[PDB]
Design a protein around this ligand. Structure first.
Ligand code: AHM
Ligand code: AHM
Ligand code: AHM
Ligand code: AHM
Ligand code: MG
Ligand code: MG
Ligand code: MG
Ligand code: MG
Lengths: 312, 314, 314, 312
């Protein structure tokens, strides 16, 4: 239509309110170019490694935005420090293409990103990225499924923008997403049943065989964190990838999968914990350290936390 | 860049339907189905920026009528079968579900169009009786998945072939020829929310997947909740998919003519099994166009691990 | 939004080729030509970000061969006619120019694919002799224009129909049915750079357009320099298009089999005339597949204003 | 590819060099959203006035850019003054869809734009737009033909960007376009032959019947100024819409068709005159006043100017 709220018309007009420099806008704007390009690549990732194109694409658009100074990728052993000539105030942690093995099976996959602000006065460095997820200034993910959706949580809310392929623009579709208090779906890889700790195994049981003789919870697990979390967000429910004996630390990385999603959830009123501490309050020591994550509708994550410390 | 020898689905069915002195009518049918599949893929892709299942249903009916290749059409969204008018008739019976899982759009989980094609084997007037053939009698069956990519999988007598929509030229382009599922897999797909109603065969099977007796690694679980998504993942990576019988859905949930049989035929033409637990899904004589049936499809060796167990509980 | 009753070119030729108990082979031919036209439209649209005429030529030959509807193919880019192998043969002769004006891409002026389809009228082995029919014997002819939109115009026995490529679903969608050119127009299209070599008939005609004797307003001039662009503008707005004979190109520039005759047939099936200045272009017996011929096409009344003048100078 | 120079990566990096505020970038960025949307509309302007959508679209994206303050359209009787809350330093004169009657005949058409800077301290007003075309700070056009091309002339050169429909991004394809000195094509509506003034009619003659007994000039006239000027630019030649007795003032409007094109030509080394004065040096009195325009390769426009004053 004639006055279409693009993601840029939206981020630019909220940046004005902070009496800013334009860097958040430039950043998100260049990110989007990566997102549309990775989407087009996946919509034909059969007519003819994608990890790599994707990574180099995102590092590139972000360097050229004159808004970053440290960039942490799933794919890179050490953090990337941006050249002085192109530096800016933001720190971005991102996984450029999450759940990549799933592309053969046409499983929705996505790019996950969390942005921090470098606060110190010394040279850009890894330590600027070792902040609590609580201090993110913006986070979100783009989901490459039947449609390409970019969900963006900033200080003012969680918003959903959809890619309109006809004009190559992200259009604002859902404003100020709030999650449901309690929902009916539980999401978890039950093929690890024997590895699970006692609090999970009891919670699973009470959902399947509800003690109140009410409706059992439906199970859903796409196997791709973005598909599952986007689901937990728009429909409500609980998603869980907890520690187990094959992974006492959890599987999902703290800086670029758990803290962004957790920031998005808590901004929409959900909770996200490791079943012991809030995810967002964990203070990272390694830019690639893993975390247990349990996130979703509040009443359900809460029910799980009572089972956790009722077992103490 | 830009290839001169594009194998489109239309070209490919013609290098099958022609050597057989065949119809080439089939081709017109399928070419029409591709128009409906493309238009649904676009609507889904801008769904949140623009009911959809109904509109899909009307599209698939109009394109099918105008192929001059159908006489009877059964739909999930329609009671009695649609008997195509004589002017436009041709010999096939198409059974279809235009947008399985249409509830799931709001959460952007992949959904899809499933179809089974029968040939009318009679001298008579078309009537919905023409649709009630057992699955073994299918001439061609497959599905269209609307996901990160739009994939058309079409199984016909010789084998299963996958096609991907090249969004630029608007054509399904061949990407996997003569597909064959793994013999055994490492995944099982079932909604364990219904764990309470499950019949004993399944419960022992699932526990044997999770807690392996012969000390293997436990099978992973995966369950998208869209039939097409879980069937396609099972076809390419392998594994076992189960929507068995439980009490709340006592003869299964999935409809026989357009969901279970098309999948069962794609799956069996790719070397996998599809059973209800007692009999093969492709041998049930259909009685209501909307009759239901339980289905277990997947890698030969895992389906059979479940049949040994079914037999042990009768 | 999203229409359920899309009239695609494939549906439309089937509601022509079917009532006539026809081929439906024609349909397969045309469906293949649409695949080539779409792939060329995309390549042009990213041309400056990615020879093209050669690659177009190979595409059109492969898609045409695989329609199982051709036996002889003549091209601007090929010497002797391509005789399709027996395995793939069918009854038509397609004469085509895969990318007229391909020089003009660099300046982003619209260019296009022109085609004429003949039916082989003999019991013999295909040979390029099968291509040398006069234009009156064309079964179907039209063009694809790559411009601000991609338009396919297809003229067949009954009339001319325009189709526009819906870029989202990748399908030519009908947008003008049974087209008819204006009787008289207000535009003349000719390259007056060649004003020195022009034969006297034309020179008096042009001066009568610019400096009207019967005190009308002078005709406007328009000359894109791409045959398809100027023919299409003449078909929809009217007017007269002239690439007559001059000395530097003494029998005209435009080739008869695939440029002049397809246009002349579209134009005459839309109620306009196409002559060389002495005879109608649709009656010349072709002798070389690359034979040339002058053409004047356009609104009946203006072509005739020029023929009165041609006759007055013989 | 992975490091694709978008129009934004280009304008942003040249704006940095001026130690600017970001407004040129914001402006061109929002303009582009109009351009891609008008392109998509014309690529299906048959499967189902366009002037109007187009106009409302461009006024809208430009207001929301926080970079304009006066906007002059072909389509609007009076100038548009932007609301204070959304004002910025630039003045834009644009014709949103030039040659619109031509869409039925699938004639390439385009959006023409010229940007000035408001220099005075008083309230935004028409007079800020009444500047010489010599003072444009940026100008160009987007052409909606077989491809959508945006040609952009700024202080540093003329550059050509092409719309990649797959990613909805303008990619930089031709850097620092220079025109040919002399070319072989002349472009003009010869259906006005009797209305032409003597200098034109003689020039026409010497091209057709070259006095030097050399190659005659080829004639080309699409009837759509952008198609013809883009042609004159990339291939060289001369384009002419001079005064005649039906139009002693010319036809093409000074502020939004003649001055932008003339700015683009002179930046690529061509010339543009009314056959009496330079186009760019004309000082506008009415925001909609017309101008004779003759533009192209230098030697050819020059040849015409000698014929003009040889006739004095
Ligand atoms: O492993 P990645 O390719 O980095 O992607 C992350 C994915 O890794 C997990 C897979 O674990 P599992 O198969 O045990 O469920 C998913 O939950 C999640 O989407
Ligand atoms: O067409 P639907 O109404 O969605 O019904 C079938 C759907 O329901 C099946 C399982 O759903 P659930 O586990 O919620 O019963 C899926 O395989 C499929 O998408
Ligand atoms: O296929 P082409 O090499 O371009 O030859 C034919 C072209 O040449 C004709 C006129 O060109 P010119 O006036 O330059 O001779 C056009 O109608 C057409 O595009
Ligand atoms: O008249 P517009 O729709 O504003 O478009 C401008 C067009 O107006 C002129 C038409 O004039 P003519 O037909 O006399 O050549 C073209 O040169 C030019 O492209
Ligand atoms: Mg990851
Ligand atoms: Mg269904
Ligand atoms: Mg040609
Ligand atoms: Mg104009």
């Amino acid at each position: 239509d004639t006055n279409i709220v693009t993601l840029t018309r939206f981020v630019m007009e909220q940046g004005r309110k902070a009496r800013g420099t334009g860097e958040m806008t430039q950043l998100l704007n260049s990110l989007c170019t990566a997102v549309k390009a990775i989407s087009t690549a996946v919509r034909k990732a059969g007519i003819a490694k994608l990890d790599v194109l994707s990574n180099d694409l995102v590092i590139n658009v972000l360097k050229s935005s004159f808004a970053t100074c440290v960039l942490v990728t799933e794919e890179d052993k050490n953090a990337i420090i941006v050249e002085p000539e192109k530096r800016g105030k933001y720190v971005v942690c991102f996984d450029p293409l999450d759940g990549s093995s799933n592309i053969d099976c046409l499983v929705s996959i996505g790019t996950i990103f969390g942005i921090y602000r470098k606060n110190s006065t010394d040279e850009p460095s890894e330590k600027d990225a070792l902040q609590p997820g609580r201090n993110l200034v913006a986070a979100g993910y783009a989901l490459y499924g039947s449609a390409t959706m970019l969900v963006l949580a900033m200080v003012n809310g969680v918003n959903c923008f959809m890619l309109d392929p006809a004009i190559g623009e992200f259009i604002l579709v859902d404003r100020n997403v709030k999650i449901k208090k309690k929902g009916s779906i539980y999401s978890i890889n039950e093929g690890y049943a024997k590895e699970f700790d006692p609090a999970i195994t009891e919670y699973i049981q009470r959902k399947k065989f509800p003690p109140d003789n009410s409706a059992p919870y439906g199970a859903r697990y796409v196997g791709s964190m973005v598909a599952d979390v986007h689901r937990t967000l728009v429909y409500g429910g609980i998603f869980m990838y907890p520690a187990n004996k094959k992974s006492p630390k959890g599987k999902l990385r703290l800086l670029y999968e758990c803290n962004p999603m957790a920031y998005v959830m808590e901004k929409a009123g959900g909770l996200a914990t490791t079943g012991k501490e809030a995810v967002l309050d964990i203070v990272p020591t390694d830019i690639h350290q893993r975390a247990p994550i349990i996130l979703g509708s509040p009443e359900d994550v809460t029910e799980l936390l009572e089972i956790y410390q009722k077992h103490a």
